[PDB]
Amino acid sequence: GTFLFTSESVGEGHPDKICDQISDAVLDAHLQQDPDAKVACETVAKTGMILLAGEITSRAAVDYQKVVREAVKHIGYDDSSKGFDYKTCNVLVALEQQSPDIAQGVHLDRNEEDIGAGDQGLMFGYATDETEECMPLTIVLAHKLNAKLAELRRNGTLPWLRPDSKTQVTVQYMQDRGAVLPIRVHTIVISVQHDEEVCLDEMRDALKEKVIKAVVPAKYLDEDTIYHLQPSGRFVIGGPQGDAGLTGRKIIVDTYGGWGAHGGGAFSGKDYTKVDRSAAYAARWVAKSLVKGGLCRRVLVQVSYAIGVSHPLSISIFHYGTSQKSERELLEIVKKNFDLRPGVIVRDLDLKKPIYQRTAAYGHFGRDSFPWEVPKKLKY
């Protein structure tokens, strides 16, 4: 009756995540000055280069050089010995205004509540009662392993660590009437960039004793757990020098780690009129509200939009058999309690606030009591 499930996470210095963080630093910089900025900022990172490309229409005056370099500094790439340095990297900017054809179809001369979706697309929300934060254990543990690496890098106790890391956690689960119950950790992978001097045995010992044991409860680890620690054997070249990064290439790390579903839309670098972000956050809010409200133990929500149209085209609820109410009944409860127009979501979730860089590593969900993590009390 048991099964395995695997999820991964990446660290703040993983090149794709660098791009997500930069794109959201750019968004935040615009929103600090112009809450109605229209932002669609993609970032590319390769050896020695950050390129910004996309579309921004805003009243803000933003120093892209400074914003980009400060984000890279925070991540920890501050010297050529680490493969990348915020002080001496190339920052190239290929930003244009938002297409006027998009603007006229989406938001020009529209009442805010009746703004159209900024694009077509589909989005999902998911929640599971297997953890208090209503997230899958696999992805929670994978994120926490990367956060622990960053902590031990920044506090100087593992000074050989560099910012680029990846983790992967496989958990053995039991099924319980559509809900899932974690039993044990089956396999853990950790790969992290390191300095030229530290040897493999020192790193593997530290990753087990100072990282895994500081994160994963001992009850989940046993003599059969498989550890793949620095499995490549050498990871000195890293960051953008080891692998090109792009915004929106970690969309499963950003969400549910393979659980539930994904509609394909990236989050970072986008203002609220891009329903890829706002409606995914709202769908998480719905799903978590259903689970915390006791209506389900596990639930997947789909919503979809057409460009220029305010109301969603479709809403669907899938409860995995974990409710006494039918999926139709839950859908009616959702429709009576939520208004998923983007110009309403923006108000309910406060999506003009410049908090987005904080979302761009360690997952957008399950953390810090962001507005989409605070369940709505449902009337039914």
Neighbours of 299 (CB within 10 A): 29
Interaction of residue 329 with K ion, rule CB under 5 A: no
Q: Whose CA is closest to 93, among 63, 58, 59, 61?
A: 63
Tokens coding 320: 């995995």
Active-site residue, from 70, 85, 243, 329: 243
Q: Is 101 in the site for Na ion (CB under 5 A)?
A: no
Q: Are 361 and 17 in contact (CB under 8 A)?
A: yes
User: What residues from 290 to 329 belong to the interface with ligand MTA (CB under 6 A)?
Assistant: 307
Binding mask 32-71 for Mg ion (x = CB under 5 A): ----------------------------------------
- Which of 84, 235, 267, 370 is catalytic? The answer is 235
Structure token digits, residue 272:
């609220």
> Tell me, what amino acid is at 368?
D
Which region, judged by CB under 6 A, interacts with ligand MTA, from 24-32, 177-185, 229-237, 328-336? 229-237
For 226, the token pair is 């498989």
Residue 374's region, left for phi above 0, alpha for psi from -120 to 50, else beta, is beta
129 binds Na ion (CB under 5 A): yes
Phi and psi angles of residue 248, each rounded to the nearest 5 degrees, phi first? 80, 25
**86 is written with which tokens?**
């915020």
Among 78, 131, 221, 258, binds its own copies (CB under 8 A): 258
Q: Which is it for strands 2-10 and 78-79: parallel, antiparallel or unpaired?
A: unpaired
State the Cα–Cα distance between residues 341 and 148, nearest whole angstrom: 38
CB 212, min distance to ligand MTA, A: 17
Looking at 5, 8, 12, 14, which residue is catalytic? 14
Q: Does 121 bind Mg ion (CB under 5 A)?
A: yes
H or E element that contains 171:
strand 161-176
Whether 186 is a known active-site residue: answer no
Task: Determine, following the binding rule CB under 8 A, whether residue 314 of this chain makes contact with its own copies.
Answer: yes
Give the active site residues: 14, 16-17, 42, 55, 166, 235, 243-244, 249-250, 270, 274, 276
Provide the binding-site residues for ligand MTA, judged by CB under 6 A.
Answer: 14-15, 99, 101-102, 105, 119, 164, 166, 191, 232, 234-235, 238, 242-243, 307
Contact footprint for Na ion (CB under 5 A): 74, 129, 195-196, 219, 252, 256, 258, 369
